[PDB]
Design a protein around this ligand. Structure first.
Ligand SMILES: Cc1ncc(NC(=O)Nc2ccccn2)c(-c2ccccc2)n1
Length: 291
């Protein structure tokens, strides 16, 4: 257990940010966490609570996964109750709400983003960041299982990072099975729905769905269908349409994440190289991509 610890006197709760079942998230002030910083803002998760052993293995797993496009984990506070998990605070909240509030369906302030809906270059910078995080996880042979824009965070400078939360204003993004167990069906490949198989290969299908969410400005995949109607066409080989804001070159990336045969799909190292090239592309080349 190389899990970093924090003393409860070093954490000062300000107010709530989010809530769930196995938690509730607070914005807090943390002292002596990072040198030269003195005091910094963090997101503190107070746990529900015998799942202390479940919490410990989860803490050990979050310590292991530390990268530039993975939501930073600082440590736990085991001294007293409730048990606390400390993470980095992300000014813009989750990627889904960020997309919806910077979309054509938004009513209105410009420090990190220009007026109006996010541009093609911004949307691609957002997609390449999520891909870079998936390259690291696939590299470590880690299978996410819940890759969606509602599980990504956006920080100062439009830095996008991957996490895994519990949500609850995103209940329609899940299909309730055994009165407790939930599935993000709309984000799952046929092998996961039909055979209950989840691998690195299935994560690229999910990233492909994330790519479609980015370009639809956070709209739900298969929104026009119910959960069973969604399972039918996912298992029957039906693909999501090209988003209005999506150029054909990018739709070619999504389609390649959606090759039914898992082994016939492009690697995440590939998808990332194709997205990084488009994000780092000059405006002249990108203006040609936009029609
Ligand atoms: C309004 C708003 N700002 C920031 C947020 N979170 C973070 O800055 N970090 C973080 C880290 C780990 C787990 C959850 N959140 C959240 C939020 C709250 C609950 C769950 C999802 C996101 N919401």
């Amino acid at each position: 257990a190389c899990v970093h610890h924090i003393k409860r006197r070093d954490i000062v709760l300000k107010w709530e940010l989010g809530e769930g079942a196995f938690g509730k998230v607070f914005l807090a002030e943390c002292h002596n966490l990072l040198p030269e910083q003195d005091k910094m803002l963090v997101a503190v998760k107070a746990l529900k609570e015998s799942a202390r052993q479940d919490f410990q293995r989860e803490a050990e797993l979050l310590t292991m996964l530390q990268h530039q496009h993975i939501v930073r984990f600082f440590g736990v506070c085991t001294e007293g109750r409730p048990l606390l998990m400390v993470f980095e605070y992300m000014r813009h909240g989750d990627l889904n709400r960020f997309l919806r509030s910077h979309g054509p369906d938004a009513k209105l302030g410009g420090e990190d983003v220009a007026p109006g809906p996010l541009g093609l270059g911004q949307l691609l910078a957002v997609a390449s960041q999520v891909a870079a995080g998936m390259v690291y996880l696939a590299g470590l042979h880690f299978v996410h299982r819940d890759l969606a824009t509602r599980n990504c965070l956006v920080g100062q400078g439009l830095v996008v990072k991957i996490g895994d939360f519990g949500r609850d204003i995103y209940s329609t993004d899940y299909y309730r099975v055994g009165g407790r167990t939930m599935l993000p069906i709309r984000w799952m490949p046929p092998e996961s729905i039909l055979y209950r198989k989840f691998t690195t290969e299935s994560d690229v299908w999910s990233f492909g769905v994330v790519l479609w969410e980015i370009f639809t400005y956070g709209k739900q995949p298969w929104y026009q269908l119910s959960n069973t109607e969604a399972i039918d066409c996912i298992t029957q080989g039906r693909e999501l349409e090209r988003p209005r804001a999506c150029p054909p070159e990018v739709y070619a990336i999504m389609r390649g994440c959606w090759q039914r045969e898992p082994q016939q799909r492009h690697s995440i190292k590939d998808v990332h190289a194709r997205l990084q090239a488009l994000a780092q592309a000059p405006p002249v080349y990108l203006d040609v991509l936009g029609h």
